[PDB]
Structures are given as structure tokens and as C-alpha cells.
Design a protein around this ligand. Structure first.
Ligand SMILES: NC[C@H]1O[C@H](O[C@H]2[C@H](O[C@@H]3O[C@H](CO)[C@@H](O)[C@H](N)[C@H]3O)[C@@H](O)[C@H](N)C[C@@H]2N)[C@H](N)[C@@H](O)[C@@H]1O
Ligand SMILES: [Mg+2]
Ligand SMILES: [Mg+2]
Ligand SMILES: [Mg+2]
Ligand SMILES: [Mg+2]
Ligand SMILES: [Mg+2]
Ligand SMILES: [Mg+2]
Ligand SMILES: [Mg+2]
Ligand SMILES: [Mg+2]
Ligand SMILES: [Mg+2]
Ligand SMILES: [Mg+2]
Ligand SMILES: [Mg+2]
Ligand SMILES: [Mg+2]
Ligand SMILES: [Mg+2]
Ligand SMILES: [Mg+2]
Ligand SMILES: [Mg+2]
Ligand SMILES: [Mg+2]
Ligand SMILES: [Mg+2]
Ligand SMILES: [Mg+2]
Ligand SMILES: [Mg+2]
Ligand SMILES: [Mg+2]
Ligand SMILES: [Mg+2]
Ligand SMILES: [Mg+2]
Ligand SMILES: [Mg+2]
Ligand SMILES: [Mg+2]
Ligand SMILES: [Mg+2]
Ligand SMILES: [Mg+2]
Ligand SMILES: [Mg+2]
Ligand SMILES: [Mg+2]
Ligand SMILES: [Mg+2]
Ligand SMILES: [Mg+2]
Ligand SMILES: [Mg+2]
Ligand SMILES: [Mg+2]
Ligand SMILES: [Mg+2]
Ligand SMILES: [Mg+2]
Ligand SMILES: [Mg+2]
Ligand SMILES: [Mg+2]
Ligand SMILES: [Mg+2]
Ligand SMILES: [Mg+2]
Ligand SMILES: [Mg+2]
Ligand SMILES: [Mg+2]
Ligand SMILES: [Mg+2]
Ligand SMILES: [Mg+2]
Ligand SMILES: [Mg+2]
Ligand SMILES: [Mg+2]
Ligand SMILES: [Mg+2]
Lengths: 146, 260, 124, 185, 159
RNA sequence: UAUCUGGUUGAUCCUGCCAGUAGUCAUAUGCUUGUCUCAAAGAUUAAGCCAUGCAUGUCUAAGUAUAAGCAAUUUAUACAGUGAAACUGCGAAUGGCUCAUUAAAUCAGUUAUCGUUUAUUUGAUAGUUCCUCUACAUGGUAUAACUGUGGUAAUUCUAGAGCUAAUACAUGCUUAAAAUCUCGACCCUUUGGAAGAGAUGUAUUUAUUAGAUAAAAAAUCAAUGUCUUCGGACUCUUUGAUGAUUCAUAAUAACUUUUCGAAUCGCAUGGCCUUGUGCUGGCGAUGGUUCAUUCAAAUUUCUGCCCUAUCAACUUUCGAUGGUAGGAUAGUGGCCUACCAUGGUUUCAACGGGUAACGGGGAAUAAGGGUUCGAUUCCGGAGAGGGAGCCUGAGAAACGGCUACCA
RNA sequence: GGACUUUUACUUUGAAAAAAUUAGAGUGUUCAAAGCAGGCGUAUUGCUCGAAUAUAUUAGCAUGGAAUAAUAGAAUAGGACG
RNA sequence: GCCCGUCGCUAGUACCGAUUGAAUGGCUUAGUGAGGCCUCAGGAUCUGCUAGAGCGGA
């Protein structure tokens, strides 16, 4: 989730083809490009007032949300700009006419403009492959009880 | 699998072809063409299996090689050619003109239409899009691409196509109280009015339908084809008008007219 | 890779092979109707099992169920067309009381003797 | 050859996977053209479905756009200066995307001293008509202008010489020229 | 019986991977390459036969060679090859110049000749005429519906 | 279609298993065998080894005939019937076979492509082409078959000499009008003008711009275009699809070992007037760039596998989880590389071991709940003695294709 | 007039759902297993019914219900409405 | 009456066991390493354009 000072990286962070002319003096030192996510997901304020780049961001980045939309509790924040959801569910064993507690751990990419921690039930949506385990992107966040 | 499958095992054929279990290992495997293969009717099923004009597949080609069959106005020579919904199939000597249109049981039905009305067909616009050079265009279910259409034609609208020139002539919008043909699913073959289109963002908008008998049923939007205005079909419907009699009601009509 | 030709066996064997009372009754049915072997008895005990089963399954469904009415009647309509079910026994509760001789009675075997033509089941 | 499949990788839980099938062409990878600075040498590559691609292994002379001025010129590409991924690409003067190379100025100086009538950082009315109107637009960054003295401009390759066969870029301006000028020092 | 391969040097046989458009292999199918023994380019006593071709002729006549001259089997076929053969002009209408050959049945000498290709014919000039007309005709009709739509657009903006 | 019965005691009631009983798409075997219909069949063991033969080739009116082929008889003096061989094109990546591998894999149901390639089919789509005299009434070589000279015990081995074609190969002409953009000789000084020179098909690469619009109204700096009661008036200011995009589409400046823009073929022989081999002209074929469609493909979401803890920790040398950049791919992506973090899985059983394990549709048994099975007719997967490599091509990591190692 | 599940589980209806096979409708293959055939009439140029229907929900999608069973909220007010 | 264990005979089953005992299949360390592909080169022999000398192409 955490982010640097903007340009920490050996390569220049910027958004693609978003150009601000040095011949034309401006107020905002850097043009910023955002987009509406869709599905009624409200691109939050931190998205438009930040300096962060994160091309994997659902807003401000080049990924797009399509496919399944999942909700789950956030069990590990420890990675950088990605986290781990624990989705819980109850599986049916027909012979015994009862259920068994199972679970699945989903890595998802948490854009800056979201500050997430363990607790923190999270909505997440299918973005296309990001890295090798990551198919989902943080979209909406709900609070923690503790 | 290393490339295109060129064979269709019989029993993997579409069931609406109504091909018998025995008689061969294979089915016709429609060619690539205007219709999607599970949704089409290869000319050989029409001529030999439906119309009974040919017996062998060998005869089917003999007929076609003579140019005795047109589809949508052009000579089609391909044994497996994939004719489908709203196609024409004009057999000139024999003076017969048909249109491929669904049973109430889901099956492409033999339907004889006049010498006119063979002169046109109804395409349902699939996408509308802006081509290069600035020219917009419209694409239909049958794969027809027509530049320079009405700007009021939208995706899911239907279209009247001339077939001599191509050339869309008028059109119907997609909205409530329109007359609708169900092109797939459980209700394939039913005809009816609209009522409600329940939309869902992200996919699969449902269209609720009500037929002449005040029966209601739903399919997906994709399965809905716009054929005209209520009680006012723009093409000749086949017998029974997509009514869906119950199995009991079917039994009564059978033994009503058979016997007395 | 030709479509498979489906088939089914037409008869069933009894659970207890040695029963005096059941082996007599089967002999009787053999002699009255001119039967060949127990298998012919058996084939009919089978048909009856299938028809009583479909009836049972219909009678647990609420009356005026479209399935109960549609399949109920058709079952009864075929049983009458052969002369197994009487001109009115026509409710489903009655097919459940139907038994084997009712079927055995309708054999072209037994009809050739029933009206003239024979003067025996074995002549028949 | 090079396979791009995921099945050869361990799974997320870290278990080792057993080989399912033999490598398939449609997962094929290829060897990198390390494009260099020299006489133009470009080989085609017949890729999936017909579809030539172009490996540029030796190049000079490519197209660079001056974004603020709205024009593009074709220049020499003197050398490579920086590179974020691997400093060996700077050592070996390898042309890849995100290059940060120096290029010839003189096609850019020739277009400025024509278009704007001025010089860089030291008649015929219709010509003087345009020169006067276009002024007040004649001031560019001091960080850029100072480069023209040396004859070479800092630019960054925007294309993929290994794919297009073109080494193409844009001359470094704006905040981005500050960043790289700071790394360069 | 292994052939020599030009320019492989060596006085021996090696095993090479051979392609299309390379001597000593005829690929049996498309993209097929084969590994075959081939004999070096350098002469040694192990050659069964050495094939040479006369460059500059010597003093005395070689009996089966300098004496008898043997004919080309076919004459020109393409138009300008006939022209290049006889030294004709662009205006010269090859036609009646082409070579014919006599063949007897048992009782009937008949003649036969090639079919000149790249011949400038009434049919060919007609095909050019049809396509040209097709181009300009369609290009105008493509403007027609195009300005016609532009009006219907301004007419729906009124609607 | 919800059933039992025999065996422990002198006897008795239990526990409890052994025995009997019934089916088996379940295989073998033994003894017996007349008719009709139907028909599984070298899976189990040895994805062990194979003699021989066969299983992949293909021509229309319509790419190439000087067969020293055949028949003809043309109207025939360019060619014209039929037609071997060979070129060229296409197919051989379909089928058929098997179940070895494979246990989060495959597979099923369900998604994804705003994450891509797609011969072909079907529908669309092309006036722009080194013009610092130049064939466009049509450029150029080069080969096969063939002829003849040869090598080898031997093969669908081929050398060297001579001929000759194309829808092979290699080249290369072009057609209206306008408008808009730079440069600018000169008009002369003013709200100041412009002759004429170039550039502009498509595609390729990059940068830049537009693609608007959730309710309104002014101010200025710069630049700039259209009216003029000639002072300034200013115009009600033209814009698609999606839940969503940097989308479709368009503009600017350029870039390119410059992609495509018919030197192709078959039937017809009509019409104009200056009658010239003039000009024009019909129905088809085969091509050709882009787009769509169709037949596909490649990844992909969600949930779901048998026995085992006498497998409890596993993963990161040598990529393990993630970040940035690049490279690569058709394309996403640790697919790979450089740098940087230290993550990722696990008693809700990870990881490992076993399977006499390909998955599924389905099969047997028939109160119900369940138990057992599914090599094998359909779908999907995998392989072609074992591995790996790769050529051609839209498509193969092919095996009745090649290369190599092992056997 | 169109749009609240705080967040679920649960339950209803529906869509989307290959054929074969299973259940089952129709049909005298001479019966039957089967098959998807066929049935009339002058048999002189014909007419015509069929090739239903039911069925996994584990999971997903759409949906009606809010009992049961969980769950979130104002307490150092840092609460709600304006 | 029942009834236990050593000892002794016969047959069958597994077990411990020197033998660094053996076999087959998977995964491997390290050294070596076939082959094609990419790439730097090489240029047998052929060709184009501007007696000559020159600039390219396969
Ligand atoms: N070579 C294999 C075949 O050999 C026999 O064929 C019989 C033949 O079956 C043929 O095959 C078809 C498929 O089985 C039948 O449907 C046809 N009616 C018939 O033409 C029978 O109609 C004859 N009465 C006997 C003949 N020996 C076997 N008995 C078949 O079972 C078997 O498949
Ligand atoms: Mg915005
Ligand atoms: Mg049939
Ligand atoms: Mg929607
Ligand atoms: Mg049945
Ligand atoms: Mg350097
Ligand atoms: Mg020709
Ligand atoms: Mg006792
Ligand atoms: Mg005893
Ligand atoms: Mg006793
Ligand atoms: Mg006793
Ligand atoms: Mg037992
Ligand atoms: Mg007989
Ligand atoms: Mg029979
Ligand atoms: Mg044998
Ligand atoms: Mg075997
Ligand atoms: Mg296959
Ligand atoms: Mg395991
Ligand atoms: Mg699937
Ligand atoms: Mg050009
Ligand atoms: Mg004009
Ligand atoms: Mg704006
Ligand atoms: Mg150019
Ligand atoms: Mg080129
Ligand atoms: Mg004259
Ligand atoms: Mg798939
Ligand atoms: Mg990347
Ligand atoms: Mg990639
Ligand atoms: Mg990365
Ligand atoms: Mg196995
Ligand atoms: Mg089952
Ligand atoms: Mg029981
Ligand atoms: Mg199986
Ligand atoms: Mg096996
Ligand atoms: Mg088998
Ligand atoms: Mg394979
Ligand atoms: Mg074998
Ligand atoms: Mg094969
Ligand atoms: Mg292989
Ligand atoms: Mg073989
Ligand atoms: Mg039935
Ligand atoms: Mg029957
Ligand atoms: Mg549920
Ligand atoms: Mg309680
Ligand atoms: Mg012993
Ligand atoms: Mg030893």
C-alpha cells in the first residue's frame, strides 16, 4: 500500500502521454489523469489530489475492472502496493447434510489512495493479470470494527 | 489440438437439425459463413433432410452444382453452406421461396413465403461503429456490414435489408411493446411483445416477454430479435405464431383434429 | 465411433429361488396359459413392477399436477387399449391392484384359444 | 526454445510442479536483439500468423519529436547516456525503450533559427512578418537551450527497436529533464 | 557415388544439413531439411568421375566434341524473348516469327508451335479498360452516398 | 422394489462374524448350443517389440503444354480438342489410435479479453504510386518437366552440359476536381496583399492534439479565424460506443533497408464515328490492403478432486511474494533480465508420499440416505519407443516432417 | 417516478444450461430390444401430425421473502438532523 | 472333567540379518556436452548499377 516521494525509481514515473508544456506556465506543476471506474465505484478524492503514479491503479492507471467482484477481509498488508484478502465460505458435504468451514487467500493490488490494514473488509474487482498471482484490484473500502 | 477441427461427429451435431442416431459417424459440419455453426442450417440438411428433394449427399451436390439454389439472392455452391435465421433460399425452377425461421420447438422450420418478401430480410444490428475515413457502419447478425446507416439505428435495433442492393430500408427501434422473436434458450421460437427490459451493468440484461396469450417469460437480451410492431409482423410468421401450447394442450389438439 | 445401440433386459428373477408356494403358482400360470419357461412369467412380473412404480410415483404427486394428469392418463390409456385395464377401472389406484394374469390374458397365445381357432393353449 | 509458460514456475504455495506436456510454439520466446549504434542493420522476424517483426541490431539516424515546439526531426543518436534497468546498457551503448540517449542538435537548431528568426543562447518581409508574430513564443527552457551549445540534446527512446526496427524518441523537457540531469550528475 | 559440393574445400566426405536451393538435395516436402554425406570440392584419386567443361579449345579437334554440334531443344516462348532472339522492335508483332516443328502421324506432317506469352491482345487491353472504369466509377459513387449522408445528417440535426 | 435364513449351548436369550441369497455394461473359465434381430471385442499384463501390404493426396470453362503424347481435323501460321510429366496453388496441423504421463494439473459448471493471433467463409473497402524525354499497345531474367553425358552393391540418391513457360521469381507505368497547410517572387505601406513553388493515397514508428458535454456568468495575457449601416459585429458555434478506457475515429509534425494500391485468367463480340486494328463496352474467375464476420486459438475468474501425519512445516543456489524498468511474446504476466524490497503457503492439512489416476458426459446396485465403478462410442486433455531441438505454415514445438542424443 | 440487503448465511422463482444415456409423450419395428419414424387418399403427378416433455444446482448470474443464525452502529460523544 | 507351558517331529507365513547385498522408476549436485536457433564473422562461387577504375546485391 505504501508509497515513496514520487520519483524514487531509477526510471521517471509519470503517466503515459499526459504532457504538460514547459512553454506554458501553469498553476498545478504536473497534469494528472484520472478516469471513472464504473459499476458505481466512486473514484475517491485521494485519487485525484495525489501525486502518486501506480500504473496498476484502477483510476489514474491503465488497468480496467471487468469480471467478478469479490469482498473479503484483509489479512496481510505487508507487501508493497498489494495485499492479501481472506475470503471465508461454508462448503456443503451432501452426505452429512451439513457444511464445513473453508477459506481462500487472494492476493490483490491495493492502489495508493487507499490506506488499508488488517481488519478492513474490502471490495475488490477483477482487473486482468498484474503479477503472476494478482488478478484483482482494490475498488471500495469499508471500515474496521476494532 | 494443432489447428481447425474439420470434422463433426454425429451425436455432437446440433439436435435441432434432427439427425438420426444411426446412418453415419458424422454430421455435415457447416462451413464458415454468415451464421454461427451451432445456430445455422447447412444446405444439405435443408435439401435432403428437410425438403426431401435429394437423397444422397451426392445428389445434394448435383442439385447445387446446377445453381438451382440461391441464398439471400446469390448462387451458393457450398454443400455445407450455413444458412440460418432470416435467410431466403430461393429455388427457382420449382418456383419456391422460403425463409429460415424457428419452430416453437426451437427447430428451423420449413416456411414458404411469397415471391416478393423474398425480396428483403430482417437483420438485427449487432454493433454500430465508426469505421475509418470517418464512415460509420452497422453490422447484423448475419454478418452484413452496411456503411452510412441511420444515426438513429442503435445496437439491438433491427433493420430491413433490401438484399438486391444490400441497402437498409427503414428499421425498428428496440423498446417496449415491440414484437419480438426469441432466437435461443428455453423459449427459442416463441414470439411476443416486450413489456420490460431489466438492465444489469456488467452483463446479461434480461428481457421479459408477453405473447398473444398473456403468457410471460424471460430470456437474455442477446436471445431477443425485434421483428415488428404488436400484431404487425414485418415477415411472414409460420403456423402457430410461436405460441407454446402446453404438453396437455398439445395432446388435445392432436386428438381433436385427428379423429374428429 | 458410431452412435451406440441402446438396449435393456425385459425380465427379472425372484429374490428367493426356492419357494414351494411361489414355484407352484408359477407352474400353474405356465399350464393355464401354455407358457414355455419361467422367463415368460418373469418378463410380465417385470412389466407390472415398472407400471406399479410409475403409478406409485404419480400417486404421491398432488392431483391436478400437470405431470400426474398427463402421465397418469397416458399410462391408463395404453393399459386400456390392450385390454389389460377394464373399461372402467380407469383410475390410477386401480392399476396398482392390477396383476399378472391381466396381462397374460391378452396374449395372442391366449386369444387364439379364447375364441375358437385352437381348443388348447398348446394348440394355440 | 525459450518458453514463456507459467507451468514451469513453482506455485504460489511454493510447491514444485510436475511437467504436464512438451513446450509449445505458441508459448515461444525469442532472444533479445541488443540494438547498437552503427550502420543500419535490421533483420525481419516472421512471427505468429504471417506478421513480420523487425529486429534492429545496428542503428543510427532516428526520429525525435520536440514536444513543446510540435515538430519532429531525424538525427544521429550520438550515444547512450543513462538507463534505468541495467547500467551495462549504458556501457555497451544499447538502444532500448526508456533509453535516455544524446542526439544531434543541428536539425533542431536549423528549424529554430529558421522558424523563430533568433539564435540559441550566445530581411524578406513575409519572413520577417512571421518572425515577429511567432515571438513571445521564442523562449524555451534554459536547461534545453544550454544543450544546443554542445550540439547534442538529451532525449529518451520511446519505441522498441527490437520490435519496430525504429529507434525513436522525444527530446527531454520539463520536469523529466530535471530528474535525469540530476542522475547524470 | 557421392557428388562433389562446390566450395566446401576438403578432399573428403562430410555430413551436412542441406536445404532447398542447395546442390545435392531435393527436399521431399516444404521446409524439410536433411543430413547427407557430400564429397569435398578438392580433387583426389577417389573420384570415380570428374566432370569438366571446355573453356578455351586446343589445337587439334576432339572427335566426339568439337566436331558435332547439337541443337537447343526449344525456341523462345515469351513475346520479348522472341524479339530478343531475332533482334526485332517493339512494333514488330512476334507471331509469324515463332519457331514451329514438324511431326508426322504416319501419313500426315502437322506442325506445332508455342503459345506466345506476354502477348498484347484485344482481351488484355479490354481487362485494363474494365478495371480503370471500375475504379473511377466506384470512387464517384463512394462520393455520392457520402455527400448524401452528409445531408441526411444535417436533416436529422433539424429533426 | 422397506424380507432374510444356516453355524457357538444340555438347553436359553444376546454380542458377533463366517456361511447361504439376489444383481452386475463384469472379466475369465468350464460343460452345452437350433432360429431371428442386435454387436462389445489385445484396455487391464507389456505407452513391450514388430516381417509384409495398405492408411494423403489433389485440376476447373477459367495460373504454366512445342510431351519428338494421344486424337484430331480445325478456319488456324502465336495459341485453341484431350492430355503424361513438371512448375505454381492448396491440403498433409482433419481424421484414426491409445490412456503412459498428469492430484490445483487435467476436467466440469461459470466468467474474462478495456489482454491477444486467426488460412479460410460471408459482408465491406483503393481516382493520389521517384513526373530532377523516362515501355503501360504491358519490364526483366531465371529454372522444372524434357534432351543428352554420368557416379554408387544399394533408397522417393543425384552430379555436371543444353533448352523453354507462370497467378513461380524479380521488376515497374499510372487518371477528376477541390480544399487545406508551409516556403515566398514581387503590390506598398495599409482593417495592409498576394501571384507560384512544394507538401497531403495507404500502411509502418514516435511525439503532440481533438474526441466534448454534472448547472451558470465575466475578466484579462498570448495566439488566431470568420461578418462588416466599415465600425468592430461577433453565430443560435457541427462531436459516436461503453458500467468504465489513453476506445472507435480524426488532426499536427516527421519517421520507413517503404506494407498495400491487378504487368493475372475464362466465356461473350454489343455499341458509337473522324473507320483508325480508333474509342467504348457485358457476365464470371483468381487475386489485393484495411475492417467486420465466421471456423478457431492462447491465456483467464469463481467454486469443486481419491488414500496418507509411520508426511508439520513449506517456498527464496539457481524466482520463492511483490515494486520499477527493460527485453521478449501474438499479447497479459517473474515469461526472462537488471535494480529494490521480504515476502508468499500452511491443522479451514500446506509441503511431501501413494494411486493397480487422464477429467467429464456417464455405469452397477434399485425404500430412502448411500456404496462401487467409469482404459473404452460424445466432449476436453495428453502422446506417438525415450527426451530435447526445430523447419515449413494461418495453425505443429507435428512424428505415416527434419536434427541430434539415448534405447 | 427510478434507485437501501450495514454485512452475510438460509429459502423461492428464473435465466443460462450439448447430444447420447436416465425418466417419459407419441408411433403395431408382425411382438420385442430398438428405431424416429409415419399417417391418409383417388395412388395421376397429391395431402398431412410428428421428431414432446421432465430432470444436477455444488458454484456463478438474475430474483421474491426476512422467521431462524450471525453481524455493523452514539459512552472521555470525535453521535444524528439542519 | 476341563486345562497351561518348555521340550520333540512335520508344513506354511512373515520377521531380525554380515553381504558397504541387488533391481526398476522419479527427482537431483557437479563435470562434460550432441544438435538446431539467434548472433559476430567468413565469402566457394553468381549478379546489378556507374579495355578502365568504382559503388552495391544474393
Ligand atoms: N463386421 C462387423 C459386423 O459383422 C456382422 O454383420 C452382420 C450383419 O450386420 C450388419 O452390420 C450393421 C451393424 O452391426 C447392422 O446394423 C446391419 N443391419 C448389418 O448390415 C447382420 O445384419 C447379418 N444378419 C449378419 C452379419 N454377419 C455382425 N453380426 C455385426 O454385428 C458386426 O457389427
Ligand atoms: Mg476526466
Ligand atoms: Mg433425419
Ligand atoms: Mg450494461
Ligand atoms: Mg429409452
Ligand atoms: Mg557511452
Ligand atoms: Mg499469360
Ligand atoms: Mg463359548
Ligand atoms: Mg460343533
Ligand atoms: Mg452341539
Ligand atoms: Mg441344541
Ligand atoms: Mg457375503
Ligand atoms: Mg429361415
Ligand atoms: Mg428378429
Ligand atoms: Mg495376438
Ligand atoms: Mg496394450
Ligand atoms: Mg486428433
Ligand atoms: Mg499432494
Ligand atoms: Mg469449458
Ligand atoms: Mg508515398
Ligand atoms: Mg469536385
Ligand atoms: Mg474541455
Ligand atoms: Mg514519406
Ligand atoms: Mg523490406
Ligand atoms: Mg481514318
Ligand atoms: Mg478456452
Ligand atoms: Mg513489463
Ligand atoms: Mg508478455
Ligand atoms: Mg515486474
Ligand atoms: Mg496411470
Ligand atoms: Mg451420477
Ligand atoms: Mg437399505
Ligand atoms: Mg474416461
Ligand atoms: Mg491402463
Ligand atoms: Mg479399446
Ligand atoms: Mg500432439
Ligand atoms: Mg509402442
Ligand atoms: Mg499425426
Ligand atoms: Mg515429436
Ligand atoms: Mg505410423
Ligand atoms: Mg416411450
Ligand atoms: Mg417399442
Ligand atoms: Mg449459495
Ligand atoms: Mg438466539
Ligand atoms: Mg519349515
Ligand atoms: Mg561390493
Amino acid at each position: 500500500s505504501t508509497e515513496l516521494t514520487v520519483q524514487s525509481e531509477r526510471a521517471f514515473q509519470k503517466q503515459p502521454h499526459i504532457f504538460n508544456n514547459p512553454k506554458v506556465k501553469t498553476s498545478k506543476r504536473t497534469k494528472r489523469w484520472y478516469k471513472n471506474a464504473g459499476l458505481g465505484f466512486k473514484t475517491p478524492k485521494t485519487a485525484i489530489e495525489g501525486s502518486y503514479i501506480d500504473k496498476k491503479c484502477p483510476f489514474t492507471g491503465l488497468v480496467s475492472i471487468r469480471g467478478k467482484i469479490l469482498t473479503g477481509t484483509v489479512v496481510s498488508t505487508k507487501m508493497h502496493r498489494t495485499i492479501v484478502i481472506r475470503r471465508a465460505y461454508l462448503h456443503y458435504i451432501p452426505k452429512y447434510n451439513r457444511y464445513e468451514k473453508r477459506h481462500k487467500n487472494v492476493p490483490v493490488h491495493v492502489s495508493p489512495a487507499f490506506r488499508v490494514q488488517v481488519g478492513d473488509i474490502v471490495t475488490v474487482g477483477q482487473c486482468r493479470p498484474i503479477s503472476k498471482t494478482v488478478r484483482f484490484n482494490v475498488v471500495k473500502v469499508s471500515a474496521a470494527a476494532g | 489440438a494443432r489447428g481447425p477441427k474439420k470434422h463433426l461427429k454425429r451425436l455432437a451435431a446440433p439436435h435441432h437439425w434432427l439427425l438420426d442416431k444411426l446412418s453415419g459417424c458424422y454430421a455435415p459440419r457447416p462451413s464458415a459463413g454468415p451464421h454461427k455453426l451451432r445456430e445455422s442450417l447447412p444446405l444439405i440438411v435443408f435439401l435432403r433432410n428437410r425438403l426431401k428433394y435429394a437423397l444422397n449427399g451426392r445428389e445434394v451436390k448435383a442439385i447445387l452444382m446446377q445453381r438451382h439454389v440461391k441464398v439471400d439472392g446469390k448462387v451458393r455452391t457450398d454443400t455445407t453452406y450455413p444458412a440460418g435465421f432470416m435467410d431466403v433460399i430461393t429455388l427457382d425452377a420449382t418456383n419456391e421461396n422460403f425463409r429460415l425461421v424457428y419452430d416453437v420447438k426451437g427447430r428451423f422450420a420449413v416456411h414458404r413465403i411469397t415471391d416478393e418478401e423474398a425480396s428483403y430480410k430482417l437483420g438485427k444490428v449487432k454493433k454500430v461503429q465508426l469505421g475509418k475515413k470517418g464512415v460509420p457502419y452497422v453490422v447484423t447478425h448475419d454478418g452484413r456490414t452496411i456503411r452510412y446507416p441511420d444515426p438513429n439505428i442503435k445496437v439491438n435495433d433491427t433493420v430491413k435489408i433490401d438484399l438486391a442492393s444490400g441497402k437498409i430500408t427503414d428499421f425498428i427501434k428496440f423498446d417496449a411493446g415491440k414484437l419480438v422473436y426469441v432466437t435461443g434458450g428455453r423459449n427459442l421460437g416463441r414470439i411476443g411483445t416486450i413489456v420490460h427490459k431489466e438492465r444489469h451493468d456488467g452483463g446479461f440484461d434480461l428481457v421479459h416477454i408477453k405473447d398473444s396469450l398473456d403468457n410471460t417469460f424471460v430470456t437474455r437480451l442477446n436471445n431477443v430479435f425485434v421483428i415488428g410492431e404488436q400484431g404487425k409482423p414485418y415477415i411472414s410468421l409460420p403456423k402457430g405464431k410461436g405460441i407454446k401450447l402446453s404438453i396437455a394442450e398439445e395432446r388435445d389438439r392432436r386428438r381433436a383434429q385427428q379423429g374428429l | 465411433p458410431r452412435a451406440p445401440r441402446t438396449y435393456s433386459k425385459t425380465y427379472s428373477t425372484p429374490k428367493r429361488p426356492y419357494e414351494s408356494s411361489r414355484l407352484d403358482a408359477e407352474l400353474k400360470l405356465a399350464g393355464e396359459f401354455g407358457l414355455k419357461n419361467k422367463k415368460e412369467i418373469y418378463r410380465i412380473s417385470f412389466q407390472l413392477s415398472k407400471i406399479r412404480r410409475a403409478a406409485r410415483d404419480l400417486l404421491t404427486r398432488d392431483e391436478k399436477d400437470p405431470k400426474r394428469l398427463f402421465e397418469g392418463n397416458a399410462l391408463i390409456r395404453r393399459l386400456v387399449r390392450v385390454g389389460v385395464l377394464s373399461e372402467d377401472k380407469k383410475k390410477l389406484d386401480y392399476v396398482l391392484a392390477l396383476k399378472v394374469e391381466d396381462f397374460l390374458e391378452r396374449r395372442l397365445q391366449t386369444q387364439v384359444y379364447k375364441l375358437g381357432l385352437a381348443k388348447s393353449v398348446h394348440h394355440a | 526454445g525459450i518458453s514463456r509458460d507459467s507451468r514451469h514456475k513453482r506455485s504460489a504455495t511454493g510447491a514444485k510442479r510436475a511437467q504436464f506436456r512438451k513446450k509449445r510454439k505458441f508459448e515461444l520466446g525469442r532472444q533479445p536483439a541488443n540494438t547498437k549504434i552503427g550502420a543500419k542493420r535490421i533483420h525481419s522476424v516472421r512471427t505468429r500468423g504471417g506478421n513480420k517483426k523487425y529486429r534492429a541490431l545496428r542503428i543510427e539516424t532516428g526520429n525525435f519529436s520536440w514536444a513543446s515546439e510540435g515538430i519532429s526531426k531525424k538525427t544521429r543518436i550520438a550515444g547512450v547516456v543513462y538507463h534505468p534497468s541495467n547500467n551495462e546498457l549504458v556501457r555497451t551503448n544499447t538502444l532500448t525503450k526508456a533509453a535516455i540517449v544524446q542526439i544531434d542538435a543541428t536539425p533542431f537548431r536549423q528549424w529554430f533559427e529558421a522558424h523563430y528568426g533568433q539564435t540559441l543562447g550566445k530581411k524578406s518581409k513575409n519572413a520577417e512578418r512571421k518572425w515577429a508574430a511567432r515571438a513571445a513564443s521564442a523562449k524555451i527552457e534554459s536547461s534545453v537551450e544550454s544543450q544546443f551549445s554542445a550540439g547534442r540534446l538529451y532525449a529518451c527512446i520511446s519505441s522498441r527497436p527490437g520490435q519496430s526496427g525504429r529507434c525513436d524518441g522525444y527530446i527531454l523537457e520539463g520536469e523529466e529533464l530535471a530528474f535525469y540531469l540530476r542522475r547524470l550528475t | 557415388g557421392f557428388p562433389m559440393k562446390q566450395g566446401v574445400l576438403l578432399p573428403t566426405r562430410i555430413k551436412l544439413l542441406l536445404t532447398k536451393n542447395v546442390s545435392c538435395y531435393r527436399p521431399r516436402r516444404d521446409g524439410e531439411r536433411k543430413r547427407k554425406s557430400v564429397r569435398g570440392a578438392i580433387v583426389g584419386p577417389d573420384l570415380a568421375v570428374l566432370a569438366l567443361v571446355i573453356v578455351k579449345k586446343g589445337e587439334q579437334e576432339l572427335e566426339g566434341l568439337t566436331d558435332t554440334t547439337v541443337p537447343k531443344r526449344l525456341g523462345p516462348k515469351r513475346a520479348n524473348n522472341i524479339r530478343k532472339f531475332f533482334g526485332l522492335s517493339k512494333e514488330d508483332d512476334v507471331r509469324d516469327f515463332v519457331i514451329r516443328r514438324e511431326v508426322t502421324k504416319g501419313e500426315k506432317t502437322y506442325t506445332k508451335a508455342p503459345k506466345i506469352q506476354r502477348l498484347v491482345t484485344p482481351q488484355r487491353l479490354q481487362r485494363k479498360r474494365h478495371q480503370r472504369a471500375l475504379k473511377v466509377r466506384n470512387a464517384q459513387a463512394q462520393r455520392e452516398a457520402a455527400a448524401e449522408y452528409a445531408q441526411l445528417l444535417a436533416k436529422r440535426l433539424s429533426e
